[PDB]
């Protein structure tokens, strides 16, 4: 195999022959350099946005992969000029990552239950790494998870304070944001390319009337997501 060993390690983890399985992902996977500015930014985002409710474990970044799915840049082109683009977390089971990288993040099928959703059938993201990391479903006997960083074109956000059955957005709105009691410090936001990265440490949002601990972000069109990084995370349980 021509591929770097961290990429090979990643392919074995995703599938349960290396170069043929890499081809099935339809994704270009580079290893982000550990000393680069990108890696420093990504590690800061992981360190700063680990919440106090989720103190069962600490997170260690093992490998950072830059990912470019085939045709996704072209699919995302209409939304790339849209304002309020953000780099946000999406966690999932390791078993879903073959489908995720080959097909992109999808909205759960019509057959999935509408009742288990805070804000309807969309694609959910967090600005707190520990919120999304819980959706890895890692365990003491299987303590390595995968987590995405997506560029999400949020546009005008419909900002809600409680769970709502959203089937359609108000005119001019492109996404929903559930407002949490705690938020990454908005004065600590940085810009990586044209994308906002909410990597400040947690503070009180000053939104008193809300039932969510942390923010979440939902989009209802799959083309509003451009996947950027895949992190292999070690969960150190307390
Ligand atoms: N996941 C998060 O990081 C996250 C962030 C903020 C907030 C939330 C919170 O989760 C709640 C929703 O969870 P639930 O799994 O019930 O719903 P839902 O998100 O629709 O489940 C579908 C699963 O299918 C995965 N997948 C997507 N594309 C593909 C694909 N091509 N191939 C295969 N699998 C794919 C996806 O990752 C997910 O695990 C929601 O109500 C909200 O409270 C999560």
Residue numbers in the entry: 765 to 780, 789 to 1010
Paper text:
PARP-1 participates in multiple cellular processes, most notably DNA damage repair, transcriptional regulation, and cell death signaling. PARP-1 has a low level of basal catalytic activity that is highly stimulated up to 1000-fold by DNA strand breaks. Using x-ray crystallography, binding studies, catalytic activity assays, and HXMS, we find that the autoinhibitory HD of PARP-1 selectively restricts access to the NAD+-binding site and provides a dynamic structure that can regulate the frequency of NAD+ binding and utilization events. PARP-1 interaction with DNA strand breaks leads to full NAD+ access to the catalytic active site, whereas PARP-1 alone has low frequency NAD+ access that accounts for the basal level of unstimulated PARP-1 activity.
In BAD, carbon replaces the nitrogen atom in the nicotinamide ring, thus making a benzamide moiety, which is a poor leaving group. We determined the x-ray crystal structure of the non-hydrolyzable NAD+ analog BAD in complex with the constitutively active CAT ΔHD, thus providing the most comprehensive view to date of PARP-1 active site interactions. The structure was determined by molecular replacement with diffraction data extending to 2.3 Å. The asymmetric unit contains four CAT ΔHD molecules (A, B, C, and D). Each CAT ΔHD molecule has BAD bound in the active site. BAD adopts two conformations in molecules A, B, and D, with each conformation at a similar level of partial occupancy around 50%. Molecule C exhibits a single conformation of BAD. The benzamide riboside moiety and the adenine riboside (adenosine) moiety adopt similar conformations and form the same interactions with PARP-1 in all BAD molecules, whereas the positions of the two phosphate groups vary somewhat and account for the different BAD conformations. Alignment of the CAT ΔHD/BAD structure with the structure of CAT WT indicates that the HD in its folded conformation would clash with bound BAD/NAD+. In particular, residues E763, D766, and D770 are positioned to interfere with the binding site of the adenine base and the phosphate groups of NAD+, suggesting a potential mechanism to block substrate binding.
